[PDB]
Amino acid sequence: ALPSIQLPVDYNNLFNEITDFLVTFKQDKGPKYMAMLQKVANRELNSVIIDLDDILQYQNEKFLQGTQADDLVSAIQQNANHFTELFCRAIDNNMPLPTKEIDYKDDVLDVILNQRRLRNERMLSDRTNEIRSENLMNDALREVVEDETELFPPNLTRRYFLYFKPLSQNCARRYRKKAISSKPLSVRQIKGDFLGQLITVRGIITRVSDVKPAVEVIAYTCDQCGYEVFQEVNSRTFTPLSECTSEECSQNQTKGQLFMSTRASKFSAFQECKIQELSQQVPVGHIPRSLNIHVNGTLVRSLSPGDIVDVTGIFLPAPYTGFKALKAGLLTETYLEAQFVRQHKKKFASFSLTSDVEERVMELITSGDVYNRLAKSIAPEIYGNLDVKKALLLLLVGGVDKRVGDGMKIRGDINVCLMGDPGVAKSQLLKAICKISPRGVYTTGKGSSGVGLTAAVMKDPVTMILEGGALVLADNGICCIDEFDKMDESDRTAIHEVMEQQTISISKAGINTTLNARTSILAAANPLYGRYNPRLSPLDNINLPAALLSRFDILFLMLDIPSRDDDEKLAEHVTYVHMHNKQPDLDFTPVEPSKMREYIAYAKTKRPVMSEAVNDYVVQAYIRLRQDSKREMDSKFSFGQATPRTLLGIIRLSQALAKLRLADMVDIDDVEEALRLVRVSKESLYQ
Amino acid sequence: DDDLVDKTKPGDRVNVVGVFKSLGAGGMNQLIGFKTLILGNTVYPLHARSTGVAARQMLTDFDIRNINKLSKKKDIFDILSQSLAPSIYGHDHIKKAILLMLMGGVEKNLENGSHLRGDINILMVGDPSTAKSQ
Ligand SMILES: Nc1ncnc2c1ncn2[C@@H]1O[C@H](COP(=O)(O)OP(=O)(O)O)[C@@H](O)[C@H]1O
Numbered sequence: 088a089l090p091s092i093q094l095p096v097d098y099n100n101l102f103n104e105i106t107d108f109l110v111t112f113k114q115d116k117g118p119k120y121m122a123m124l125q126k127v128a129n130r131e132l133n134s135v136i137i138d139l140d141d142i143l144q145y146q147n148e149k150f151l152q153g154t155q156a157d158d159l160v161s162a163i164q165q166n167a168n169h170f171t172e173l174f175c176r177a178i179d180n181n182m183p184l185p186t187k188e189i190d191y192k193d194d195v196l197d198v199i200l201n202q203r204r205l206r207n208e209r210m211l212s213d214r215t216n217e218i219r220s221e222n223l224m225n226d227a228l229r230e231v232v233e234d235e236t237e238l239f240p241p242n243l244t245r246r247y248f249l250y251f252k253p254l255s256q257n258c259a260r261r262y263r264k265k266a267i268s269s270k271p272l273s274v275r276q277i278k279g280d281f282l283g284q285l286i287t288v289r290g291i292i293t294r295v296s297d298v299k300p301a302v303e304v305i306a307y308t309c310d311q312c313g314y315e316v317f318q319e320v321n322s323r324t325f326t327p328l329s330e331c332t333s334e335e336c337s338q339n340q341t342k343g344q345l346f347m348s349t350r351a352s353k354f355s356a357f358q359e360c361k362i363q364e365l366s367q368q369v370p371v372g373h374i375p376r377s378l379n380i381h382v383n384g385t386l387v388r389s390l391s392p393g394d395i396v397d398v399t400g401i402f403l404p405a406p407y408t409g410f411k412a413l414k415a416g417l418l419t420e421t422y423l424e425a426q427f428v429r430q431h432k433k434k435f436a437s438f439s440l441t442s443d444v445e446e447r448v449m450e451l452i453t454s455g456d457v458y459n460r461l462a463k464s465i466a467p468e469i470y471g472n473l474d475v476k477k478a479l480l481l482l483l484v485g486g487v488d489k490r491v492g493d494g495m496k497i498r499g500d501i502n503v504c505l506m507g508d509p510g511v512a513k514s515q516l517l518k519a520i521c522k523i524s525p526r527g528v529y530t531t532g533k534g535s536s537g538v539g540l541t542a543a544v545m546k547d548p549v550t551m552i553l554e555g556g557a558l559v560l561a562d563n564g565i566c567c568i569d570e571f572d573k574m575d576e577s578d579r580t581a582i583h584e585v586m587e588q589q590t591i592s593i594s595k596a597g598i599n600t601t602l603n604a605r606t607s608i609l610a611a612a613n614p615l616y617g618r619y620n621p622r623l624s625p626l627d628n629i630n631l632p633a634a635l636l637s638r639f640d641i642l643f644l645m646l647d648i649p650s651r652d653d654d655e656k657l658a659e660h661v662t663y664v665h666m667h668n669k670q671p672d673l674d675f676t677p678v679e680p681s682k683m684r685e686y687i688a689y690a691k692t693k694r695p696v697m698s699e700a701v702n703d704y705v706v707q708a709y710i711r712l713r714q715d716s717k718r719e720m721d722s723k724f725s726f727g728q729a730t731p732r733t734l735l736g737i738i739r740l741s742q743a744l745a746k747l748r749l750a751d752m753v754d755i756d757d758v759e760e761a762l763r764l765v766r767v768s769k770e771s772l773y774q
Numbered sequence: 775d776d777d778l779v780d781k782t783k784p785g786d787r788v789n790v791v792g793v794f795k796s797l798g799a800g801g802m803n804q805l806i807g808f809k810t811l812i813l814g815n816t817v818y819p820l821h822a823r824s825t826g827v828a829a830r831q832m833l834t835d836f837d838i839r840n841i842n843k844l845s846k847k848k849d850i851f852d853i854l855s856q857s858l859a860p861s862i863y864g865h866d867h868i869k870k871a872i873l874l875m876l877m878g879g880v881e882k883n884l885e886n887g888s889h890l891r892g893d894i895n896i897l898m899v900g901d902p903s904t905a906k907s908q
Contacts, residue, residue, distance in 0.1 A: 468887050518888055668885045
């Protein structure tokens, strides 16, 4: 009964060689990870990051200089779960322990482990005194002390954590080895044979839960024998235990009666979410599935919902089956444990490094004529509309704010509407804008109702929260909106509530919340039946009241005059699209969006300040606008009224225009550009 | 079973060949047991009138040699145009496009941009009883 199997996997010399690689590494002053371990011993960091490349670099290094190394990349790659603690107990062999005197305000966790380090040694110092005092080289005298005393386990006092990291193909491109762990694989590609492996998946973060502590081990005070009982739980649920389980309360008539304790237990950060399929490699008639991923420890609070992320980890089952009668006997429900996060579309306001950044940013700066180059680069796949692209470049900036303090804020947001139909292909840009921009949700007219894009209340799974909508999702980002003309009339009311910032009021059956939203609005509606009748007026061919048009600072019109000379360049434009896969030729090179947004995000941290001469230039220029707008008062081609919100925008615009100079140099040509985009945006209906 | 997991989406027409087996203790332990199932199976999706794939049609070397003999001509577009009106008089230029929609055009998705649409969509209009429903 119960036979045994030998396998080529060893645990002995692998533990020996993994000690040497943990010690002997010099390439990337002294040893790399010991200085990191001294930084861990500095008690200022909680994570340990292990690559696979320096392993493979070492594995290249040992064969070329010495006889033979045991393979260790594919060794970890197979089972990958026993390599957690068998690696980590070798770390505690070597440690620069007293490297800094403890701070009084360091950590309440730190003062507890310092006790259990010291209480271990003082208990160790007692037993070696009694044995030498009762005699009848001292290694066996040391060894007698080792087994006659109950101690705290070394698993109980750790204070740090370790996360693995998958290898890139880049070093695998030089020397091909077991690079199977890092491929963009699908949930459909997850066959049930990849259990225990280390994988790489990607998708969309959907229905993120909340972070709440997970109990791991529980302390138990005796109060009679004075020991501490410890119970490790790896199940879903558990039980409290009996009255005592001491060795000294044992073999005695009166046992104790215990109770647990809070401050001595060890907890863990816990939160999970679900990943939906990428919706690009899905077969032609299928519906995307989901997958459960547990997240533990340091990496928590790092995954916003509705993103694109590369998740790598190791693939483990959970003991669970479905309904009671449907159980075929051994039903294994799986999950994935998160190990490393690499996000596509790297989020702004999260970097501070500038040196390797300005290694490429200064080359963009020293390229010359940058501001005209930018709007050429965002969605260049149409012809013309450069001033139209120029304003949308400025929509990408935004990024200004001011509160007077004990008062009100001002919203530094731009709201550009688009009018015209149909051969301008506006939706080619509408998909392009929310694609490059981080936190970009593409929305339609009817597919969200008045309750859809706002929040909702449903029963919480395992961890009655407010499940939010798209505008709840796409805060601090830009919402792309199709066909505002066909919304619900109640859905119009919420949009007016965004033009005053952060306001979403709810007076439903049990909900009285006023939730906040740092969103941004782009809208595009179509004109009336027919197309551009000069017999029709402004607001005659418009299906919306002008109070909503007063809330729009910037408005465009998409004319289509069939002109003879404008076609031949546009004909050569569109035919060149299908000849190749790139439009510009010998005059321009496009900016890739990843390098583009980093220059944007660095420009988002400037906050230019105005001056006094630019104060003088704007005031009389507003008297220019206020005087000639109020001399018509008609339903003619000119619009009716000029708001003070027009001045609120154009001050904010030249402020945002100063941000692309990155210099806090609000000047005369700063404002000179701002007036040009006002008079051309309006009244382009002359031809 | 193992190589047979997930060949069908819900909503198709599939032939199933297997063995009708009844397991379980039918209530005689301590009101009806003997629930049944079918195992040892092979799965064959079949074409519907309006659901699922019909592209399982084979091509022999004898077949394609006829196609290669056919495509070496100069007026086969006319013959294929006149072929699709088996019982309908006229409508010559209408039938020509109906070849072309099933061709579907070419699709070239741009590098890190958007796709460019390739298929073709047609509406017709006319007086009734003029082969509109035919
Ligand atoms: N050119 C034609 N050749 C042969 N039959 C025709 C022709 N035009 C109409 N028909 C007859 O018209 C009938 C179909 O009517 P149809 O125009 O398709 O319906 P509806 O106009 O209500 O959509 C068929 O039964 C067919 O026999």
